[PDB]
Structures are given as structure tokens and as C-alpha cells.
């Protein structure tokens, strides 16, 4: 009665069994294609690796500008296939810092530097890409470039317009110290304490 | 000790088009190009293997009289026919020709 509705199709997929939910998702894709929620519900109701990979490939062929579909496609394949999918997701959606961070983390340092440069050229106001580049530099053989990278990131944030609020930097330092990046975490903590006498 | 298994899950869903390998080995000068709406992948004519010092196309004179009547009109043989001539005419074992 009410076609081309994502919430009604999601409720019909959640209320029906999976053998009926597959046909309901096929009818919803035939009535209203390029839906990220319907494709995610179809990939979630597949209970297989190849069926979910085919559903993710169909969602990428229908709507390639979906970050959730690319995140669902990259998390279910091989890590080399995950990097090959994250490269296409960064080439199709340059405004996704999480896909660029996943592409830089799942590759070599010579590719991670180019991925961080492309993320800085595409999104200069992003602060998580610079923290990911600092963590990748601290995880490599270099140890003194993290402070210069943090200084360059602070200069780029001061020149772009994102002021230091001293609340997300402490969380980024805690996430870096919880993941084995204590040098960049200490540098971010010193940069937050320097911009954040007795009081 | 016996367990009822799923006979339909272990079977191949594609059948004749079921590819057991994930990657495909391509030659050196076999690049592809997407011109307009379709991708053309070319593979050139591969060079044949060079014949050895003791490997050549055996003529009909090396075949015995029991096999000479079947090869009427053929002066010489092929490379795969001469490389396995003793395994198909002089040997009665089970042969597997992947040609």
C-alpha cells in the first residue's frame, strides 16, 4: 500500500522469516533501489559469506557512494581484499576519514603516507586522519617524526579554524595509549596541556 | 557413529561454472582496457615449447604394422602424439592426457 519506504520495508524484513525476508528485500530493491538500509538488512539476513559478498557487490554497483555499504563490504573479506575495497571507497567517497584510516592501517608505510596525504588534501579539517598518520609513524621504525607531525597537525588545525577544545585530544591520546602508541599519545597530551600558571 | 549431513550445502551452486580458484594467472603482455561501456581483455598467441634433442614428431615409419593401418594419409604425427607414443601403443596402463 505504501511503496518506496525504507522504514516499512525494514519493519517487514524484521517481522518476516528470512526465507520471506529475502524475497521482501528483493521486492523492496525492485521497487526502491539504491537503499543502504535495505541492502544492509539483506546482507544481514543472508547467513553466508558468499551471499553477503554478492549483496555488498550489488549494493556497491547500485549505490557506490554509501559509506555503510563499503564498511560492510570491507569487514567481511580478506585483509588484502579489504584494502582493495577501501582504496575504491576512498576513490569513490573522499569525505570518509574512517575508510581512509582503514586503508592506511591495512597497508605498508609507503602507501599509508600517500593515503594520509590524500586524506589531508581532501579533508584538511579532519583531525583523526592526522592522529592515524602519527600512530602509523610511531608504529614504524621512525620515532622522532611523530612530534613534528603533531606540530604540523596543530598548525593546520589553527590555520583551518578548528580550535583545540582539550576534550577530544585527551580521548585520542587515551585511544592511542590503549592501542600501543604511547609516544604520539604523550605528544598529544603535552599539546593539550600546553594549550589547556597555578590554576 | 553415523551422522546425517547436509547433502545440498556441500554441493556446488554454480555447477559447471563453479570456479575453485579465486585468482587467475595471466600472461605478461595480456593487459586489458575499458574503452566505452565494456572491458576488452586480450591474450596474445603464446609461443610453443621448443623441441628437445631427443624429442621430435615421429613419422608413420616408427609405428608398427598394427597401428599403421589406422593412420592412413598422415605422414608425420603431432607433438603430443609423439611425446606419448610409447604410452598409448606400447604400454597398456591407464593414461591421462591433459591436452
Amino acid at each position: 500500500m505504501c511503496p518506496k519506504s525504507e522504514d516499512v520495508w525494514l519493519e517487514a524484513a524484521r517481522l518476516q522469516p528470512g526465507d520471506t525476508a529475502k524475497a521482501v528485500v528483493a521486492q523492496a530493491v525492485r521497487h526502491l533501489p539504491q537503499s543502504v538500509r535495505i541492502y544492509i538488512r539483506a546482507a544481514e539476513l543472508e547467513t553466508d559469506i558468499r551471499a553477503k559478498k554478492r549483496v555488498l557487490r550489488k549494493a556497491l554497483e547500485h549505490v557506490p557512494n554509501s559509506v555503510r555499504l563499503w564498511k560492510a563490504a570491507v569487514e567481511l573479506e580478506e585483509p588484502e581484499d579489504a584494502r582493495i575495497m577501501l582504496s575504491r571507497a576512498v576513490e569513490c567517497c573522499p569525505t570518509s576519514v574512517e575508510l581512509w584510516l582503514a586503508l592506511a592501517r591495512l597497508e605498508t608505510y609507503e602507501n599509508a603516507r600517500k593515503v594520509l596525504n590524500k586524506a589531508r588534501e581532501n579533508i584538511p579539517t579532519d583531525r583523526h586522519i592526522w592522529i592515524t598518520a602519527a600512530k602509523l609513524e610511531e608504529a614504524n621504525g621512525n620515532t622522532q617524526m611523530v612530534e613534528k607531525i603533531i606540530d604540523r597537525a596543530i598548525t593546520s588545525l589553527r590555520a583551518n579554524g578548528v580550535e583545540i577544545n582539550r576534550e577530544q585530544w585527551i580521548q585520542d591520546a587515551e585511544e592511542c595509549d590503549r592501542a600501543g602508541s604511547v609516544a604520539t599519545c604523550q605528544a598529544v597530551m603535552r599539546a593539550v596541556i600546553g594549550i589547556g600558571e597555578e590554576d | 557413529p553415523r551422522q546425517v549431513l547436509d547433502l545440498e550445502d556441500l554441493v556446488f551452486t554454480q555447477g559447471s561454472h563453479f570456479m575453485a580458484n579465486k585468482r587467475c594467472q595471466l600472461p605478461d603482455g595480456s593487459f586489458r582496457r575499458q574503452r566505452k561501456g565494456y572491458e576488452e581483455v586480450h591474450v596474445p598467441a603464446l609461443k610453443p615449447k621448443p623441441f628437445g634433442s631427443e624429442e621430435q614428431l615421429l613419422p608413420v615409419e616408427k609405428l608398427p604394422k598394427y597401428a599403421q593401418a589406422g593412420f592412413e594419409g598422415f605422414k608425420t604425427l603431432n607433438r603430443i602424439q609423439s611425446k606419448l607414443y610409447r604410452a598409448a601403443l606400447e604400454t597398456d596402463e591407464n593414461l591421462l592426457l591433459c591436452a
Binding site: 581484499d81 575495497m85 | 585468482r23 595471466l26 572491458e39
Partner: peptide
Amino acid sequence: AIVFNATSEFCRT
């Protein structure tokens, strides 16, 4: 050598 993959075929199409 033209190596075919799923991600390259998804990005090219």
C-alpha cells in the same frame, strides 16, 4: 599481467 579481482571489478563497473 591483468589480475582480475572482485574489488577492481566493482570499482571499474
